[PDB]
Design an enzyme around this catalytic site. Structure first.
Site, short mmCIF file in Angstrom:
data_model
loop_
_atom_site.label_atom_id
_atom_site.label_comp_id
_atom_site.label_asym_id
_atom_site.label_seq_id
_atom_site.Cartn_x
_atom_site.Cartn_y
_atom_site.Cartn_z
N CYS A 230 0.85 -1.22 0.00
CA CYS A 230 0.00 0.00 0.00
C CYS A 230 0.87 1.25 0.00
O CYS A 230 1.66 1.43 -0.92
CB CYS A 230 -0.91 -0.04 1.21
SG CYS A 230 -0.08 -0.28 2.81
N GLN A 231 0.67 2.16 0.97
CA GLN A 231 1.58 3.31 1.17
C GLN A 231 2.74 2.97 2.10
O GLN A 231 3.90 3.28 1.80
CB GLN A 231 0.83 4.53 1.77
CG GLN A 231 1.71 5.74 2.08
CD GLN A 231 2.07 6.59 0.87
OE1 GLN A 231 2.79 7.61 0.98
NE2 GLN A 231 1.61 6.19 -0.27
N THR A 232 2.44 2.33 3.24
CA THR A 232 3.52 1.96 4.19
C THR A 232 3.53 0.50 4.63
O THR A 232 4.17 0.17 5.62
CB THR A 232 3.29 2.75 5.46
OG1 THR A 232 1.99 2.41 5.92
CG2 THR A 232 3.19 4.28 5.18
N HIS A 233 2.89 -0.37 3.86
CA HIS A 233 2.67 -1.76 4.23
C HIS A 233 1.90 -1.94 5.50
O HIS A 233 2.25 -2.78 6.33
CB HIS A 233 3.94 -2.61 4.22
CG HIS A 233 3.68 -4.09 4.25
ND1 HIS A 233 4.47 -4.97 4.94
CD2 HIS A 233 2.70 -4.83 3.67
CE1 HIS A 233 4.00 -6.20 4.79
NE2 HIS A 233 2.93 -6.14 4.01
N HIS A 234 0.93 -1.05 5.74
CA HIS A 234 -0.03 -1.24 6.83
C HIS A 234 -1.30 -1.95 6.34
O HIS A 234 -1.60 -3.09 6.75
CB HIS A 234 -0.50 0.09 7.42
CG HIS A 234 -1.67 -0.05 8.33
ND1 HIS A 234 -2.55 0.99 8.61
CD2 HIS A 234 -2.14 -1.13 9.02
CE1 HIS A 234 -3.48 0.56 9.43
NE2 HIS A 234 -3.26 -0.72 9.70
N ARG A 235 -1.91 -1.35 5.33
CA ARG A 235 -3.19 -1.81 4.79
C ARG A 235 -2.96 -3.15 4.08
O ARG A 235 -3.71 -4.11 4.30
CB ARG A 235 -3.76 -0.77 3.81
CG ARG A 235 -4.42 0.50 4.45
CD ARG A 235 -4.82 1.57 3.45
NE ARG A 235 -3.67 2.33 2.93
CZ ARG A 235 -3.73 3.19 1.91
NH1 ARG A 235 -4.92 3.43 1.35
NH2 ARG A 235 -2.64 3.85 1.51
N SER A 236 -1.68 -3.24 3.59
CA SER A 236 -1.35 -4.47 2.83
C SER A 236 -0.97 -5.57 3.80
O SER A 236 -0.68 -6.68 3.38
CB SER A 236 -0.28 -4.21 1.77
OG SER A 236 0.91 -3.63 2.30
#
Length: 271
Positions: A230-236
């Site tokens: 995602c943007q910071t590998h949180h949502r992903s």
């Protein structure tokens, strides 16, 4: 995997409640200090989401340094028989990211609480405001790169036939309408399935049951290597965990994510 050996990766509130007193359980809570204090699942150990992230430029979504990792896992009581159960209160992004960290440290046995605290709460299940005692000092760790796609690795694989890139951001980010880096757009060839589209708000944010067909619709199939971000590998964190849960054999988190990709001189972008 002891009393948890018979379950699949994604388990329900009932399976956990039945097993809260299992001596090999390391139950991890990635909600927030306030939520954890208001009431967590009994025996749950709090891991502030920030602690899962390097949190330094130029790629803050990378895994934390070895030292923070050793102490964190030492605090949790990491040990050979351990079986982790992980939850958060947002539908699984932080829980899924913690699970990617578990892959990063070689842990084989863990489970995701489907719907996490949201599901647990919907069912009026027991809450505790008590703190478990931390295990001990930092444990010495073995770290793996396999679960993770570096920027160069992904650059090298672009356009390949056996790769799918599962961009978990909002469609507006994917189309570069909402720009959070020097470059807006997506990774060439990537497809989009926002993390929240995988949750079912009608079932307390569990993973939607029709998830496999929806991923298949986009070419996100298990015969391909899946690289998600995602943007910071949180949502992903959630989408990595889903691919795993469905039994995809080849899955990586691109931890740099758009925070890196959208800011790096070398990276091609597509709209």
């Amino acid at each position: 995997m002891d009393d948890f050996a018979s379950l699949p990766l994604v388990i329900e509130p009932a399976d956990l409640q039945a097993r809260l007193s299992a001596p090999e359980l390391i139950l991890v809570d990635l909600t927030s200090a306030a939520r954890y204090a208001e009431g967590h699942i009994p025996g749950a150990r709090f891991v502030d989401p920030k602690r899962t992230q390097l949190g330094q430029p130029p790629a803050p979504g990378l895994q934390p340094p070895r030292e923070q990792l050793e102490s964190l896992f030492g605090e949790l009581g990491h040990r050979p028989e351990a079986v982790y159960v992980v939850y958060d209160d947002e539908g699984g992004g932080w829980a899924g990211r913690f699970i990617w960290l578990l892959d990063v440290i070689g842990q084989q046995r863990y489970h995701y609480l489907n719907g996490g605290l949201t599901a647990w709460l919907a069912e009026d299940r027991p809450l505790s405001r008590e703190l478990p005692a931390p295990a001990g000092g930092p444990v010495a760790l073995s770290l793996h790169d396999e679960p993770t796609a570096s920027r160069d690795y992904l650059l090298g694989r672009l356009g390949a036939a056996d790769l799918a890139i599962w961009d978990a951001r909002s469609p507006q980010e994917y189309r570069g309408e909402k720009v959070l880096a020097a470059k807006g757009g997506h990774i060439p060839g990537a497809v989009n399935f926002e993390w929240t589209a995988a949750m079912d708000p009608s079932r307390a944010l569990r993973i939607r049951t029709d998830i496999a067909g929806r991923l298949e619709e986009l070419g996100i199939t298990p015969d391909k290597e899946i690289v998600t971000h995602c943007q910071t590998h949180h949502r992903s964190g959630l989408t990595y965990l889903i691919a795993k849960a469905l039994g995809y054999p080849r899955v990586k988190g691109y931890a740099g994510s758009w925070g890196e990709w959208g800011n790096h001189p070398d990276t091609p972008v597509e709209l």
